[PDB]
Amino acid sequence: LGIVDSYLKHQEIVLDTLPQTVSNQWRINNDYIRQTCTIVEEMNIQQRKQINDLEIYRKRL
Amino acid sequence: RMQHITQGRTSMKIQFKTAMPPTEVLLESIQSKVESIEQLQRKLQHVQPLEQQ
Amino acid sequence: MLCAISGKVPRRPVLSPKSRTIFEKSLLEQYVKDTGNDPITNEPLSIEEIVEIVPSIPNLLTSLQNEWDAIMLENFKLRSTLDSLTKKLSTVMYERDAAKLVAAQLLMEKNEDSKDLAPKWPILKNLELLQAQNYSRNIKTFPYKELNKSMYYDKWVCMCRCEDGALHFTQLKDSKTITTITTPNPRTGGEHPAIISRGPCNRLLLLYPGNQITILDSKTNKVLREIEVDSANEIIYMYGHNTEYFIWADNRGTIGFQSYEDDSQYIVHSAKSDVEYSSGVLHKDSLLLALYSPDGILDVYNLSSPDQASSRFPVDEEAKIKEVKFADNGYWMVVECDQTVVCFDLRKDVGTLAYPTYTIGTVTYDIDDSGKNMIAYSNESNSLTIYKFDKKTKNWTKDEESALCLADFTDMDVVCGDGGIAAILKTNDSFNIVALTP
Amino acid sequence: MLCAISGKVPRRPVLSPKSRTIFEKSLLEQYVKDTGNDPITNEPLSIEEIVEIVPSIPNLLTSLQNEWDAIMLENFKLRSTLDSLTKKLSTVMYERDAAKLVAAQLLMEKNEDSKDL
Amino acid sequence: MLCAISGKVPRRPVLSPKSRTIFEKSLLEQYVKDTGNDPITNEPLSIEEIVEIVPSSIPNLLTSLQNEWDAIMLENFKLRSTLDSLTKKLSTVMYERDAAKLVAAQL
Amino acid sequence: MLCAISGKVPRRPVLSPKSRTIFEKSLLEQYVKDTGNDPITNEPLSIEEIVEIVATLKANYSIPNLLTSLQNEWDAIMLENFKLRSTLDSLTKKLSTVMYERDAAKLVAAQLL
Secondary structure: OHHHEEEEHHHHHHHHHOOOOOOHHHHHHHHHHHHHHHHHHHHHHHHHHHHHHHHHHHHHH | HHHHHHHHHHHHHHHHOOOHHHHHHHHHHHHHHHHHHHHHHHHHEEEEEEEOO | OOOOOOOOOOEEEEEEEOEEEEEEEEHHHHHHHHHHHHOOOOOOOOHOOOOOOOHHHHHHHHHHHHHHHHHHHHHHHHHHHHHHHHHHHHHHHHHHOOOHHHHHHHHHHHHHHHOOOOOOOOOOEEEEEEEEEEOOOOOOOOOEEEEEEOEEEEEEEEEEEEOOEEEEEEEEOOOOOOOOOOEEEEOOOOOOOOEEEEEEOOEEEEEEEOOOOEEEEEEOOOEEEEEEOOOOOOEEEEEEEHHHEEEEOOOOOOOEEEEEEOOEEEEEEEOOOOOOOEEEEEOOOOOOOEEEEEOOEEEEEEEOOOOOEEEOOOOOOOHHHHEEEEOOOOEEEEEEEEEEEEEEOOOOOOOOEEEOOOOOEEEEEEEOOOOOOEEEEOOOOEEEEEEEEEEOOOEEEEEEEEOOOOOOOEEEEEOOOOOOOOOOOOOOOEEEEEOOOO | OOOOOOOOOOOOOOEEOOOOOOHHHHHHHHHHHHEEOOOOOOOOOOOOHHHEOOOOHHHHHHHHHHHHHHHHHHHHHHHHHHHHHOOOOHHHHHHHHHHHHHHHOOOOOOOOHHHOO | OOOOOOOOOOEEEEEEEEOEEEEEEHHHHHHHHHHOOOOOOOOOOOOOOOOEEEEEHHHHHHHHHHHHHHHHHHHHHHHHHHHHHHHHHHHHHHHHHHHHHHHHHHH | OOOOOOOOOOEEEEEOOOOEEEEHHHHHHHHHHHHOOOOOOOOEOOOOOOOOOOOOOOOOOOHHHHHHHHHHHHHHHHHOOOOHHHHHHHHHHHHHHHHHHHHHHHHHHHHOO
16 A cells, blocks of 8 residues: 555656756757767877877887 | 556657667767777877886 | 857867866867956966866766655645645635625525426337346447338447357347347457447457457358557547448547458548547438547547548536437437436537536436437336427426336436337346337 | 755755744755745745755665655655545535525525515 | 754754854853854844744755765775776786787797 | 766866866765875875866656666666776786786896897
8 A cells, every 4th residue: 555655646746747858958968978979089089199199209219 | 647647758758769869879889989998098008108118 | 068158068178277167178278369368257367277178876866856855845835735725624614604604694684585585209108128138348339220121220229248259249229129149259368349330241340459450240250351450549439330431530539441341541530639538429421420538528520521620519527428429310419428418409509509408326318319209217216217308398308107127227228110119228247128118 | 953844854954034944955945936935934035035054785775765655655645635635625615616606696685685575 | 953052953943143053042042141242253143133943864865875875986986096007007017028028029 | 078986977077186187076075085185196185176167768757767777776886896896806916917927027038138
């Protein structure tokens, strides 16, 4: 009984619960992640370039 | 009541199933790239000591 | 973490120590080149003071915090509301007495006021039981009009019993002829069909969960076809005597036509978000379909015009719709509520009644296809009363009453035809068929 | 000392000068944002009038589950009891509505008493 | 919620509006009746300005769990900071070893 | 911009000026109170030197679903901390052995030179 009593209240919370979120929140979440993916790719490349530039500095010095 | 909530949820799930697989595919790309990045850091901070040596 | 200037996530983030603010590198550096300042504080800032930055559990914790916030405000308002309402409850107990001062002074003032002041049914006083049988009340079995050997239609009413892997159908149009037909139940697990309707040439439409329809030939007992309907919403109406096509409808109001023999099919109306239906009924001209549920939703769709909007008919939510019928006159839509009847005149504007709604937990009733004869059963007296709609007095007038010689009957249906009037009286598990005779 | 909104010991306790009552900051702030009022007295209250007050491991989630279900049972017993009181009050609303309905009927029957001569 | 003077949960809790601070009723009132002032700030304070607080764990559980998560993430990152620095030390020693392995391969 | 300690987006983002690196506030502050230091560089770092910086799914809508997700992620990071300790052991062993491999390679060099 008492689990179901609290869970019926839980259900009444789940009912209430997103129009604000519907686009913008997930739009921002996605676009933020796309930003993080873009900078993550750039950081991969930037690291690679730094590896090569330090290897050439050793090979020259 | 549980199905009534599920009808609400569905109304959102149809909307958000546009955005949710992008967020998943993006987060999978993060997990792939951050491994690639940590390996890049490791080799950078080994060749910096061998430059000093 | 947004750049203050762009409002967007930086691709090369930097921090100003003056404003403690994240920027895109280039934007902060350009602003400093243009001004020598921080953009937020306006304080003097060189490029070199900028800090370049070296490259869901706590969100769930702050979520549960804000949820706890919302629920504590909720239990709070429930406490405040409960106090406000018990205050209004003792106050409205007092308003029963405060009303007794003003309203009961008015009641003693009004105690002082009132103190100072188509075939026609014969006479039928006898009855007999023709049948008693068990049935499966969850098998909604739609009645069918059938063309007599004289070219006019008789409605047949049908009850189904599903038991021992067979379907048994008891059918009548009048008190003279009652027939029981038996077919297998085609479904392999013995699962009961939810709706059954006759089609032409011995066809039987059987609707199963998941919107699966089986066409069964009732004389060969062979499955002719299995159709899986493309709707996520439960089918709540399915009818065959439309003759190439049957008609079906969702609880959301998708309405579709489907060929028995082939893939010829079409949709005339599409699912709405804000309705639920439990049943439907089709007008004699086969163009108007009423879809309804007990909570007073009654929408009529014109099947000839897919773009024509449904007409909403006004019924009180507490009335509770048991059944809707279209009368043989073609212009009464007869709505059987639990204790009262609402009759709409379809010639007139939507919501125009044919006669005022009036009330005659003990009683069940049915109206005939004329819309003008009613039989009602009382579970207290165990008797059938006949009411007739009187064309001079515009009301249901009691005409005769007859007693049964016998559980409670929760539902009933009337049939009439040349053989005579019969009442089908239904318990939750069983039915009785009673002829009415002179 | 407990928050009057939550019935729980506040993490960031505050006091209204109107109701003289302890609250959790977030809750009284949310309440004032939404209503402009004190929650107990319903008098106008601005945020600037709120006084901010100057100062098991694997089972901890089961402890939370039990304590949270204690909120949530409490929220049911509140909501359900408040529903029974709204039910009896709905009948008292039909009492006051039928009192208005009958009073309307009787101020008609007062015209009837006025012609009874 | 502790009295600033005693450090304990008051028996009759009150607030000074001047210091925005909880006190035991009698401890704050002894200072006000004597001085007319708040004892923390020395600002003027009457008895009528003392707010007498009308008598009455999930956000504690959240605070505890968040600080437990802090301690977990600090333990796991003292492990990660050690792992990153030791794998940097490992790679350093491994490459200096390889410089010597290029020598031994020639030899 | 993710926290170096947690790999999440911070709730309360902060930068150590020592390591020029982004952290969640309570994580960096817990290190500073415990150690007085930056957790990346081990340089001295006071609380005052920390530069403070100026969605949920459709199913993540109920307390049972949100707590079960929470407990899943919490139990995950607990077995993750235990495995992190056990893999950190496998690298610590390999570090001590390889340091002495370098020194022994210098001995093998002395034999071969």
